Ligand binder design. Sequence first.
Ligand SMILES: C[C@H]1O[C@H](O[C@H]2[C@H](O)[C@@H](O)[C@@H](O[C@H]3[C@H](O)[C@@H](O)[C@@H](O)O[C@@H]3CO)O[C@@H]2CO)[C@H](O)[C@@H](O)[C@@H]1N[C@H]1C=C(CO)[C@@H](O)[C@H](O)[C@H]1O
Ligand SMILES: [Ca+2]
Length: 842
Amino acid sequence: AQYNQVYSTDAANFEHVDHYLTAESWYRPKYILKDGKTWTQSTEKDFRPLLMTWWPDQETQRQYVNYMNAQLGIHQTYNTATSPLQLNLAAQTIQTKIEEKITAEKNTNWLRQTISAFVKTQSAWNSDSEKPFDDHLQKGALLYSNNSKLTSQANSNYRILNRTPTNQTGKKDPRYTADRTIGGYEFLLANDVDNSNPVVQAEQLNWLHFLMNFGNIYANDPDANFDSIRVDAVDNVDADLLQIAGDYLKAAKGIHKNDKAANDHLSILEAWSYNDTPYLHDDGDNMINMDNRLRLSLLYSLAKPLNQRSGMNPLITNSLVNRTDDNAETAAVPSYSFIRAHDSEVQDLIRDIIKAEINPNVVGYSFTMEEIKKAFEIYNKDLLATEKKYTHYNTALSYALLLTNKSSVPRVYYGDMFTDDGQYMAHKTINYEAIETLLKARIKYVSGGQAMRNQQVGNSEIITSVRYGKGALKATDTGDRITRTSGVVVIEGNNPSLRLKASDRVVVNMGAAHKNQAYRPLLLTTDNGIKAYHSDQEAAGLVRYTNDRGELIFTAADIKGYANPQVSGYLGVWVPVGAAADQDVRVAASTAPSTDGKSVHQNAALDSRVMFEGFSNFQAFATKKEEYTNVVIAKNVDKFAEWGVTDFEMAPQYVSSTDGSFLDSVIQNGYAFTDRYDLGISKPNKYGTADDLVKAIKALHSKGIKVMADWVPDQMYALPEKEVVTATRVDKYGTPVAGSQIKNTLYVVDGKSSGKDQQAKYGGAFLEELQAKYPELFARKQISTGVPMDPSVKIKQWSAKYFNGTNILGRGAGYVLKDQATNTYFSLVSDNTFLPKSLVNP
Ligand SMILES: C[C@H]1O[C@H](O[C@H]2[C@H](O)[C@@H](O)[C@@H](O[C@H]3[C@H](O)[C@@H](O)[C@@H](O)O[C@@H]3CO)O[C@@H]2CO)[C@H](O)[C@@H](O)[C@@H]1N[C@H]1C=C(CO)[C@@H](O)[C@H](O)[C@H]1O
Ligand SMILES: [Ca+2]
């Protein structure tokens, strides 16, 4: 009894969290039974575990001896039958052995840990009370109560959930109907930042500005800023952030004034809902979104297994732009196109491989480093197979359309040019040649109106895609010298068993500027792969002519199906003969004032851009300075120039967390981070040091290339400090989970930043300069909240009050200790102290 009770009931006497007690709390007893022999006065050194002497119920005080009788080598145990009395000596017997084992161990860490192991063995302290799980990527979420007396420092007047672009107002937008859902959901991974909180919005703005001024702020070098941003996980945050970020580009960079200004800071969303493009358009085209339909069309018409491949027509018409005849000087809506990304169609395929040939139950993308490399042997091998079982077919065919299509900024994926695993740019993919050739031809030849045709021939079908040449929007436009020596034609089949009859002819119209002209191949499919023609010269043997009307004509002699590691179907591309070594048909954005109330315009100048996604989730880690990506990037700034890369999308530069709780923090891509401002500052990030970063931004700028910052306002990982919140189990939309036990109940989260990281340094730091120069950003009443941002407080330290909630942590429904008689939390706040009866009054 007595000695065991609490030395005194001050906060100082307990390891508590927000003045609550957890099943893992140690405390300071009055005396310690020194070496279970005699009873000293507790000095401030003398902290013992609570469970050593108190138990939530008797039933738990039971497993506790049993389990602890194991450890210390006592060789008794009791079943459910036993009297209280015995359980109570068993435990004192257990305590002596704990001192005698603390003296002889000269510490008490060995116990820190037999305790923990045991807490873990118990339901209410363990995932079991967290079920049932749901389809959240990490199995479940906890939503934090807005109003709890128990945890008032964690209250909030916001935590408005699910305000995606479609649902920004708390009701599905009537305007946009292609996606009939509400267009996203709130909880994605880790600690969900509540971007419906006006103070937080302000802070995202702070952060945005900082990124965009990185050079000035961090290196004092105006030449090292990020030019643009990518908004990550749009469909999982409050869309207010879109007017916020849009407002900022307009106020600080003037993108709304003319295209030249707009294109120098060209920014994108990652927004998957079909509703997000029209949404963004009506919002003023202040950044551009992906073309989701065209991506899907390429995926299914070209990349999928031969038996799951669809017809080719969708390559022409399932897109934001119908490319049957695209003759518009400016497209109705701007966008970027891609076939693969760092996540889309990469990490999927790896998960496919694990699930299929390594771990059957693997969850979401919570892979191990193990599984991954195991997976990559299968994958790299399939990459070279003609019959692919996991990886894409026809990569070159997809890039041929992406790089010649009109009315979209094509984004090339690093991993389609270099190996998805492996040191930065160390190994070229089998497609690097064709892609590079296209990239280079694009600069020289791709310009003008477009026509695409789908023709049924032989036993299958082909499509033709043609670009008329610089400054001919129409088939009848005749243009000038340069028109004559520009344009291109791509011909594609998606069926290895394509056969033309002898009489069959694919008659392509190349445009008025092209009568009676010699053309030569650029790429041709061959039995083993695809053959690239780097100049007129190199292709002298294979010239062919257009006729009187500017038509190229093709025959069984040219077109037939193939099956090799590169092509499953048919690819042919032709270009006019006689273009100057240095011919360049791209075109510069004009400074003429914009008058349509949009910022970005999909015109010839925007089509002149190419975006490069310059990383891979699955890159090797650098073994040495020379291998750091940002080091390598600076050194190869010329290749990108040579490819026509105008916008370099860098990976997120935040220093990665390493808890391993998701793929992101296993391979450290930079989407999982604890410090928003720590861009390789406190230690190198996967890609190099903050200085290596600066130099790579500088290198790219030296070529005039723009550099994009991945803005990640959705979540944060691995917060160092604990906090107690009032929590509820919820699925990804924030709906309470049926039959869960965690319902408005205290939970200990990892919800606090260190108060002394970069965040502490820069949080809210420029709010003041921002309100001074751009007062209108702070005038706007944000849509979901009805009110402006609130810069009146700075976020110096993240804490649960700025979050919506968190992924379950496996701590349990009863981790915060409760008197079961009264059903009350124990509390150590000094006016209101409430302690386990035995410990205070024995
Ligand atoms: C990875 C990505 O996930 C989140 O987006 C999800 C979409 O909301 C879901 O729709 C589904 O997207 C699918 C499309 O609806 C469907 O058309 C089909 O094409 O497949 C699409 C993807 O398979 O799945 C997506 C994820 O389940 C989220 O909005 C986005 O942030 C996520 N990407 C970023 C997230 C992080 C961390 O923030 C990193 O892992 C990624 O690399 C980021 O790019
Ligand atoms: Ca969110």
